[PDB]
């Protein structure tokens, strides 16, 4: 194609404008600043509660903002809202489609979303008039499997699907408001910033972008990984995030420095990381691998603090409460282990 | 107080409302075969049917895209993957069915699943053997040095030149199947026929053959 092979090279000439100024703004590394503070040690967490209610493998899980209730979606076709203090169930919602890949609990506590291979985000109303759990809306705009969804409030919800797009919905009108195009591979997980004005999204092209909710533009793109991204989570101040992938490596990126800081890899670990999450202070980076165990990483020294291995099958999710009190882990056996 | 022990008691009584429902739904889930139709409600295309008081559950995944390395991990707890293959500017689609089969057969999460593959549209192929003046061994050059196996059932009407081209593709999937399958999961090759009351029975007789081999490996008799 004429007047195009220079355009393909004008992009690679402009990526060299990125990667030299991104290198010129690297005074040191995250290791040799940190190496004066002393580490935490062996963090021996124990299974407190074990939630035995599903039938098939569990893909997702999301805590509530009171840090007491938690949704878990499993691919038997049902969605169960637990109670983490006393192991008893408060709801059990029969889904229409059996292959559910995500779930969310609204920050007010009134709504629960889900979604999967039916390409539809389904909103459920927990505080209805007569007393039931019936479908409020069915957000049908995506042309691919829905992999993650998170509420901003009770009115709007941002989703990420396997059609390489993210979308900002509006549950009252049922239709999209802003779509977020720009990824090349299937977007697997998003994570909201704490101020809910920005979010990031890791996809299967080894690149996690950064989106702006009110405008709809991708501000900056983070490429440090080798293989497909399976998880994402903000550092709790809103200026960094960690990124799990299939090359058995977490990477703590930074927004203002605009590049990777640290690399959480150990050579005895070869299998991919299903999910990631920080603690309340951000010192610990927990990360569930494709192997049946969960590894705590000290997110500043990049040394493995502790290992939490209470699962008989690959963990499919990972969630730390808003008060930081416990850690819930789900897996492909029908079990939710709560750790602290 | 009495009041906090009053709704704590009503919270535990919500278990018996739904743990009785979970045991009600555990019965219908375990006696239902979940299959997977993939060939080589707008997105999952679920299909229920009933063969001799046995519930089946099909899933057609045509509503998705074609980078299937992520959503195929959902389908590990299925009993069998039904894998239809069209036998037919020659795009070489038949090798594409071999490489997709080789990736399912070697996937880490799909190392326990048998494949029921239907070699389809031999009526389109039995014309293209005679009407093709050259051969279609230009794509498979190891076809001239291949003979029909003796333990074969050549149905009449088709030439042995068509029978040789029909069983060569079947052995080409078993050369992938028997390379690394090591007894955990097998392959059940078939040929498509009149669909009503004869093609679903081949799925039914193979899904008994998978579960009867499944328990016999739990008892280590196979």
């Amino acid at each position, epitope marked *: 194609g004429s007047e195009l092979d220079q355009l393909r090279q004008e992009a690679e000439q402009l990526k060299n404008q990125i990667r030299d100024a991104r290198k010129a703004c690297a005074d040191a590394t995250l290791s040799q600043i940190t190496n004066n503070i002393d580490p935490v040690g062996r963090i021996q967490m124990r299974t407190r509660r074990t939630l035995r209610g599903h039938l098939a493998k569990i893909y997702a899980m999301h805590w509530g903002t009171d840090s007491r209730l938690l949704v878990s979606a499993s691919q038997d076709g049902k969605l169960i809202i637990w109670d983490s203090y006393t192991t008893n169930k408060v709801h059990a919602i029969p889904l229409r489609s059996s292959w559910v890949m995500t779930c969310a609990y609204a920050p007010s506590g009134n709504y629960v979303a889900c979604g999967g291979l039916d390409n539809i985000c389904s909103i459920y109303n927990l505080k209805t008039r007569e007393g039931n759990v019936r479908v409020s809306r069915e957000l049908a705009g995506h042309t691919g499997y829905l992999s993650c969804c998170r509420f901003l409030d009770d009115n709007q919800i941002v989703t990420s699907s396997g059609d390489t797009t993210c979308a900002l919905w509006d549950i009252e009108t049922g239709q999209q408001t802003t779509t977020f195009t720009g990824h090349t591979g299937d977007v697997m997980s998003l994570s909201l910033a704490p101020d809910t004005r920005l979010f990031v999204s890791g996809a299967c092209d080894a690149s996690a972008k950064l989106w702006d909710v009110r405008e709809g533009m991708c501000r900056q793109t983070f490429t440090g990984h080798e*293989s*497909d991204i399976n998880a994402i989570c903000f550092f709790p101040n809103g200026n960094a995030f960690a990124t799990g992938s299939d090359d058995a490596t977490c990477r703590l990126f930074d927004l203002r420095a605009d590049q990777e800081l640290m690399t959480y890899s150990h050579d005895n670990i070869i299998c991919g990381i299903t999910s990631v999450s920080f603690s309340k202070s951000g010192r610990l980076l927990l990360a569930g691998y494709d192997d049946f165990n969960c590894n705590v990483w000290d997110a500043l020294k990049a040394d493995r603090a502790g290992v939490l291995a209470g699962h008989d099958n690959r963990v499919s999710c990972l969630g730390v409460t808003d008060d930081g009190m416990a850690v819930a882990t789900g897996s492909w056996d029908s079990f939710l282990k709560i750790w602290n | 107080t009495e009041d906090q022990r009053n709704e704590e008691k009503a919270q535990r009584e919500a278990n018996k409302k739904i743990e009785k429902q979970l045991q009600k739904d555990k019965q219908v889930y375990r006696a239902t075969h979940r299959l997977l139709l993939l060939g080589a409600t707008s997105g999952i295309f679920e299909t229920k049917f009933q063969v001799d008081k046995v519930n089946f559950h099909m899933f057609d995944v045509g509503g998705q895209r074609d*980078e299937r390395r992520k959503w195929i991990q959902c389908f590990n707890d299925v009993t069998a993957i039904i894998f239809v293959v069209a036998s037919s500017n020659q*795009t070489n689609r038949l*090798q594409e069915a071999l490489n997709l089969f080789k990736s399912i057969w070697n*996937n880490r999460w799909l190392r326990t699943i048998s494949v029921i593959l239907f070699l389809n549209k031999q009526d389109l192929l039995a014309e293209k053997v005679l009407a093709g003046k050259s051969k279609i061994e230009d794509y498979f050059p190891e076809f001239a040095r291949y003979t029909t196996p003796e333990d074969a059932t050549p149905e009449p009407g088709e030439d042995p030149r068509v029978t040789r081209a029909k069983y060569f593709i079947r052995d080409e999937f078993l050369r992938i199947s028997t390379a690394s399958g090591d007894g955990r999961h097998y392959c059940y090759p078939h040929f498509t026929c009149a669909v009503d009351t004869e093609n679903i029975r081949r799925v039914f007789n193979d899904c008994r053959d998978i579960i009867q081999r499944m328990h016999l490996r739990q008892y280590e008799l196979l």
Partner: nanobody
Amino acid sequence: QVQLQESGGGLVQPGGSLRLSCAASGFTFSNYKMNWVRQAPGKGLEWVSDISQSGASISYTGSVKGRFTISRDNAKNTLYLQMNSLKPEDTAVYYCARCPAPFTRDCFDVTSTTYAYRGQGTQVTVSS
């Protein structure tokens, strides 16, 4: 960034030989299952040849068996494809891909115009 920059490929009469090579950059090259993908004009993307994580297991399309030989040099991080005795219907655009995970044997890569870990293309033209 995972980048696959490739060279080689040009005008050649049928019977002649070429040599393609993509020097990979941005990942550990010794952990992935590299492979070549072909797209003829008017046709879909088509698989050509595999190579294992070290060089043990080698596969081919049947229509290129015996003519093409694939090679991997781990120390220089590049992937060779030695083509002998070209055909006039082998004129296409050749891509080198990789299988998306380390230490695996399965691959999902001969797909549509969207795929992440694929080179940009080298034109190979066989005519007279």
